[PDB]
Design a protein around this ligand. Structure first.
Ligand SMILES: Nc1ncnc2c1ncn2[C@@H]1O[C@H](CSCC[C@H](N)C(=O)O)[C@@H](O)[C@H]1O
Ligand SMILES: Nc1ncnc2c1ncn2[C@@H]1O[C@H](CSCC[C@H](N)C(=O)O)[C@@H](O)[C@H]1O
Ligand SMILES: [Mg+2]
Ligand SMILES: [Mg+2]
Lengths: 242, 242
């Protein structure tokens, strides 16, 4: 409608955690994450923590885990769907080798412009091709243009959660055999464990439903092998088998 | 501990979880783990769940994650410290290529023999060189014989938890540059988040203190990059930089 959309202040889940206690998550961040966090990632996180959609920001411990995965698999060409202010994007660009290439897709370039100065200061702007667009049309055009030699090593999916199953049908063809697709937020604040969950915002309830469907679909999908990981808000790593 | 020491019934922490919802952990297992668990892994887990040291068994969602890491990094030669009934060992042997090789070290061969029939029926016993011994003498001899061309790609450390920092000093020389060292249980039931934690068996208290010291050590160690991951009982992935 012409009015203002829902704000995260209208959401019921934003103060929820999947870990046992706030103290345990704080321990992980202070002990194992902040001492290992790039100065420009720390700056980007601190600005984003103030932003109207801060609850969408990828967790910082999850960021270091994505970095580790990219380095262990020697990824060099990646795609990111859902950029926001650029925390996972800057994480990825810092992790890739100097000639690494990232295709980054978001509908909102104004969000990306918040993180862009941090990306520039980190020296990794040259690795990023930012596409201001809804992701599905971009992915569908890639299916017509891209050749086998151009396939992606790694995909991070963190945009509009109800569309994940649709993204999957494209990305399992756009990531190479043996490549990885990582879907963020697949435990959705712990709500996926319940067939009914009271008092959610309609937009939060739509994601509870879509993630329960997606988690079943990925578990049954013979094109990939999976690992669901209780880090951050949950993520699911998919490895393409054929 | 399972190696030696007090019995499991003497411990306080065995039923505690790092996730705040038992429903959520069951959801992950029922949705994303059991449908993807090898038949022989299922049988080995079911017998081990009845064993007197069942609390030491690696979590099954953690197992799929270790498998994913091994495949994405194209591991071919690995070392395991702490075998118990062999769940992580079988997971690793199933993940590796057909000519992959595992060095498996445990003080108690009788535990390994509980799992061996499942490993044999899975057809991957041939990848495993089991060494019945304390781990520290084995690693010290390996530093005596190890050639650069034979460095391990991957190490899983899951044995006697107070010795991890000692294991680390050898493993950062026995794993290749860019190889991974994974330390299991680094969140120790969540107790690491507290400077004091009443109500623990003395062996459990010793691990709380040792993991608190280890987590600081790894976060400050310039020889590796790290990611601490809140899966299972917590684990820390280390990547050797030089
Ligand atoms: N259909 C769509 N196509 C592309 N981007 C979309 C989209 N729908 C929503 N988005 C974008 O997806 C982003 C999700 S938040 C992304 C978080 C970010 N990856 C981080 O590391 O913090 C938002 O910026 C939103 O604008
Ligand atoms: N000093 C030591 N050297 C080698 N093994 C040891 C050891 N101290 C204890 N252990 C062994 O380490 C094991 C820890 S439990 C290991 C769990 C196993 N990796 C799994 O996947 O389930 C026990 O079997 C114990 O016997
Ligand atoms: Mg997210
Ligand atoms: Mg363990």
């Amino acid at each position: 409608g012409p009015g203002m959309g829902a704000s995260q202040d209208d959401y019921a889940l934003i103060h929820k955690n999947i870990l046992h206690s706030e103290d345990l998550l704080k321990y992980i961040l202070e002990t194992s994450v902040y001492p290992r966090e790039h100065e420009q990632l720390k700056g980007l996180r601190e600005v984003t923590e103030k932003h109207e959609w801060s609850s969408a920001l990828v967790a910082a411990d999850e960021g270091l885990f994505l970095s580790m995965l990219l380095k262990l698999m020697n990824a060099k060409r990646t795609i990111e769907i859902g950029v926001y202010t650029g925390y996972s994007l800057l994480t990825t660009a810092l992790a890739l080798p100097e000639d690494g290439k990232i295709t980054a897709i978001d509908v909102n370039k104004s969000y990306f412009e918040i993180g862009l100065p941090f990306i520039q200061k980190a020296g990794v702007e040259h690795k990023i091709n930012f596409i201001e667009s809804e992701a599905l049309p971009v992915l569908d055009q890639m299916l017509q243009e891209m050749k086998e030699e151009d396939l992606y090593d790694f995909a991070f999916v963190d945009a509009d959660k109800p569309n994940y199953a649709n993204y999957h049908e494209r990305l399992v063809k756009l990531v190479r055999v043996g490549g990885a697709i990582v879907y963020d937020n697949t435990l959705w604040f712990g709500t996926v464990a319940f067939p009914e969950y009271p008092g959610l915002h309609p937009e939060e309830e739509e994601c509870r439903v879509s993630f329960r469907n997606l988690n079943k679909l990925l578990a049954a999908d013979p094109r990939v092998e999976i690992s669901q990981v209780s880090i951050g808000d949950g993520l699911t790593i998919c490895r393409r088998l054929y």
